[PDB]
Design a protein around this ligand. Structure first.
Ligand code: MYR
Ligand code: MYR
Ligand code: MYR
Ligand code: MYR
Ligand code: MYR
Ligand code: SAL
Ligand code: SAL
Length: 582
């Protein structure tokens, strides 16, 4: 249609269109100041309104890629500030855009964004709510060049609502903070899952992406029939390949359509797409990708009939290896909203391997005869851990639980740095408090969901600077054998304890005056070092120490001369403790 800008502006709205342009520009010209971007947004909006008015007006004729490009090349400090990227401006448009995406530095060396005090934020919020939000929107956008914009926008609306409620509240900091933290993490989690999906689609390729996709889709639209789940899985894939390649336009358009299809054929896909499909252009996608599982038919047969009985198995498995294998997943996926996706792939794999080392031997039906029995333990392992751990997390709290966790993992890989151990042992323990609350039915998917990034997180830090071969083995292992592999790490008996660092176990009183969620990180660092000084330490021996210490803080922090015992009763502990640890 005539004038792309006109159209985009119209069904987007000036308010969003402005936010989006700001973000898109914040994602490329990551170095220019906040004001310089505001100049662009206004300049591009005023233009866009020109087209809305007269579709045949100057340049409206042009495509969105061409316009965005030309204006990007306007920035005068382009070659001085961005150097090389300025060369892109000579290339004709297809190449020009492609050239810009190659230079969208994934990780700029920009400072850690700090959190000003609640009082200043609320005041900046009030005084000028507009530039307050758009200025931070810009702060995030430039630091995460690949974050799908519409999504980043959605996180903004949520940030706004937090102030509207918290700043008007009696106790602001008691309101704002916890809402902000949860909001931060969620956004961090969101960003990590986006790099995952893209890293995988490249390491393991399309096939594995598709398998993971068929499973997850059929687990959500169990009432849809395989032909449909296949159509969706194809398109959904086209989407991710593109949205990873970076181009925001292509991506947004692909995602738009995909949501049209789903809502047009809503009746044959899910009954839960009700709300989402009623939402505006912008949220449909985000919404749809977040919809809850529909409910399965309960009129479903048995995977044993079609996949283990009839002598037409291999006949069918060879007519087209992948489709058949796909159907196995689909079928098994929809009867199991409670299984984690890697678990389902872990089965399909086992089944495939079997039909392989079977349809080539003597009597086929006697070979692939008892597969479902080879599954039992595959389904059992993740389930047992879930319960075994959630059980413990109910006994001790989220904190005491995290401590049981770092004592464990420190013993397994004592070669890891203490900050990293603590970092991990915490996000891990956090998932416990964020999943164990769920009824068993939805526990395994929860864990998988989080755990996935906490592991991808770990596998990157370690990549930057490896320390252990095991951890490197698991990190490079099949993205489906990744969790079992870490689950499989055994205590390290090669390891040789760090020498007694008298300093390491010295405390003053700063701990009686540090934020609780800061007063632990301290304790949780000493523990790691205690376990590293004497790993042969028993669960009882250890606990005996953590008791003499836990008391020592109190019955001494709350003691007139707040620093005598600490360097005083502190010597007794350090001297008594190693006498009880040989
Ligand atoms: C995702 C869009 C965010 C837009 C700006 C909302 C206000 C953010 C306030 C400051 C917090 C930065 C992150 C942090 O919590 O450390
Ligand atoms: C240079 C002009 C940039 C104009 C903004 C284009 C972005 C349009 C986004 C459309 C949203 C589709 C919704 C979705 O898939 O979540
Ligand atoms: C405190 C964290 C508790 C985490 C739950 C225990 C771990 C269960 C295994 C998670 C894996 C789900 C996917 C899979 O089968 O690998
Ligand atoms: C920095 C080193 C961290 C080492 C700990 C490995 C992470 C394991 C988490 C995933 C598995 C949880 C269940 C299990 O421990 O079997
Ligand atoms: C060589 C003996 C060193 C003894 C001192 C080690 C102190 C370890 C701190 C334990 C903290 C447990 C956490 C808590 O008390 O909540
Ligand atoms: O800190 C945030 O608010 C945030 C939001 C979206 C993506 C990554 C993030 O760190
Ligand atoms: O990201 C999407 O657009 C999507 C659409 C339909 C189902 C699952 C999804 O993640």
């Amino acid at each position: 249609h005539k004038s792309e800008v006109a159209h985009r502006f119209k069904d987007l709205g000036e308010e969003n269109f402005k936010a989006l342009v700001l973000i898109a520009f914040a994602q490329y010209l990551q170095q220019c100041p906040f004001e310089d971007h505001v100049k662009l947004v206004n300049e591009v909006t005023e233009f866009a309104k020109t087209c809305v008015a007269d579709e045949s007006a100057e340049n409206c004729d042009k495509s969105l890629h061409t316009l965005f490009g030309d204006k990007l090349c306007t920035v005068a400090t382009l070659r001085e500030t961005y150097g090389e990227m300025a060369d892109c401006c000579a290339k004709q448009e297809p190449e020009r855009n492609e050239c810009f995406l190659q230079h969208k530095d994934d990780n700029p060396n920009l400072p850690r964004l700090v959190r000003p005090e609640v009082d200043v934020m609320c005041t900046a919020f009030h005084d000028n709510e507009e530039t307050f939000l758009k200025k931070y929107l810009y702060e995030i956008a430039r630091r995460h060049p690949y974050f799908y914009a519409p999504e980043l926008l959605f996180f903004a609306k949520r940030y706004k609502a937090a102030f509207t409620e918290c700043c008007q509240a009696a106790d602001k900091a008691a309101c704002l903070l916890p809402k902000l933290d949860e909001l931060r993490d969620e956004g961090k989690a969101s960003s990590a899952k986006q790099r995952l999906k893209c890293a995988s689609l490249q390491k393991f390729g399309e096939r594995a992406f598709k398998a993971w996709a068929v499973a997850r889709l059929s687990q959500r639209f169990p009432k849809a029939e395989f032909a449909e789940v296949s159509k969706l899985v194809t398109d959904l894939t086209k989407v991710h390949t593109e949205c990873c390649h970076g181009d925001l336009l292509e991506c947004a358009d692909d995602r738009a359509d995909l949501a049209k299809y789903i809502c047009e054929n809503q009746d044959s896909i899910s009954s839960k797409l009700k709300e989402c499909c009623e939402k505006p252009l912008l949220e449909k996608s985000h919404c749809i990708a977040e919809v809850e599982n529909d409910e399965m038919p309960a009129d479903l047969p048995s995977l044993a009939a079609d996949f283990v009985e009839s002598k037409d198995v291999c006949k069918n498995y060879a007519e087209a290896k992948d489709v058949f294998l796909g159907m196995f997943l689909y079928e098994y996926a929809r009867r199991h909203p409670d299984y984690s996706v890697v678990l389902l792939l872990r089965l399909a794999k086992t089944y495939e391997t079997t039909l392989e080392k079977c349809c080539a031997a003597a009597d086929p039906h006697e070979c692939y005869a008892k597969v479902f029995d080879e599954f039992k333990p595959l389904v059992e392992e993740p389930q047992n851990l879930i319960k075994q751990n959630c059980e413990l997390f109910e006994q001790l709290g989220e904190y005491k639980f995290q401590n049981a966790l770092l004592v464990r993992y420190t013993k397994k890989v004592p070669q890891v740095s203490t900050p990293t151990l603590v970092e991990v042992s915490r996000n891990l323990g956090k998932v416990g408090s964020k999943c164990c609350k769920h009824p068993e039915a939805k526990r395994m998917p929860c864990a998988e969901d989080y755990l996935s990034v906490v592991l991808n997180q770990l596998c990157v830090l370690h990549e930057k600077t490896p320390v252990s071969d095991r951890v490197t083995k698991c990190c490079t292992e099949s993205l489906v054998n990744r969790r079992p592999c870490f689950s499989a790490l055994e205590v390290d008996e090669t390891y040789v304890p760090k020498e007694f660092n008298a300093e390491t176990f010295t405390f003053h009183a700063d701990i009686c005056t540090l934020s609780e969620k800061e007063r632990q990180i301290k304790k949780q660092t000493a523990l790691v070092e205690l376990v590293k000084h004497k790993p042969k330490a028993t669960k009882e021996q250890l606990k005996a120490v953590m008791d003499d210490f836990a008391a020592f803080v109190e019955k001494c922090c709350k003691a007139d001369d707040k620093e005598t015992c600490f360097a005083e009763e502190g010597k007794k502990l350090v001297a008594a403790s190693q006498a009880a640890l040989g």
